[PDB]
Amino acid sequence: MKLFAQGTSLDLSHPHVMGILNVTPNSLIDAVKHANLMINAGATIIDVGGESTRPGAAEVSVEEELQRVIPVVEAIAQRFEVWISVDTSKPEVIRESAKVGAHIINDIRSLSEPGALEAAAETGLPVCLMHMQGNPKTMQEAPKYDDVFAEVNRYFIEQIARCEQAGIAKEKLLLDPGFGFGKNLSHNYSLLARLAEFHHFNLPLLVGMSRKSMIGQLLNVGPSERLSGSLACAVIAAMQGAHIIRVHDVKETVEAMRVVEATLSAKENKRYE
Ligand X SMILES: CNC(=O)CSc1nc2c(=O)[nH]c(N)nc2[nH]1
Binding site for its own copies (CB under 8 A): 185-186, 189-190, 192-194, 215, 218-219, 221, 227-229, 231-233, 235-236, 239-240, 251-253, 255-260, 262-267, 272-273
**Where is the binding site, in residues?**
22, 53, 87, 106, 176, 212, 246-248
> Is 175 a residue that touches ligand X (CB under 6 A)?
no
Assess whether 251 carries a catalytic annotation.
no
CA distance 248 to 47: 10
Q: Which of 90, 212, 251, 267 is catalytic?
A: 212
Return the bridge partners of 129, or none.
Answer: 107, 175
CA distance 220 to 223: 10
Task: Write down the least CB distance from residue 230 to ligand X, Å.
Answer: 10
Task: Write down the least CB distance from residue 269 to ligand X, Å.
Answer: 25
- Taking every pair of Cα atoms in the chain, the longest distance, rounded to a whole number of angstroms, is 51
CA distance 147 to 152: 9
Q: What DSSP character marks residue 179?
A: T
160: Cα separation from own chain's centroid? 17
Assess whether 109 carries a catalytic annotation.
no
Integer-rounded Cα Rg, in Å, for the chain is 17
Q: Which does 232 bind (CB under 5 to 8 A by kind): its own copies, ligand X, none?
A: its own copies
| Of 136-144, 172-180, 235-243, 251-259: span binding ligand X (CB under 6 A) | 172-180
149: Cα separation from own chain's centroid? 18
Binding site for ligand X (CB under 6 A): 20, 53-54, 87, 106, 108, 128, 130, 176, 178-179, 206, 208, 211-212, 246
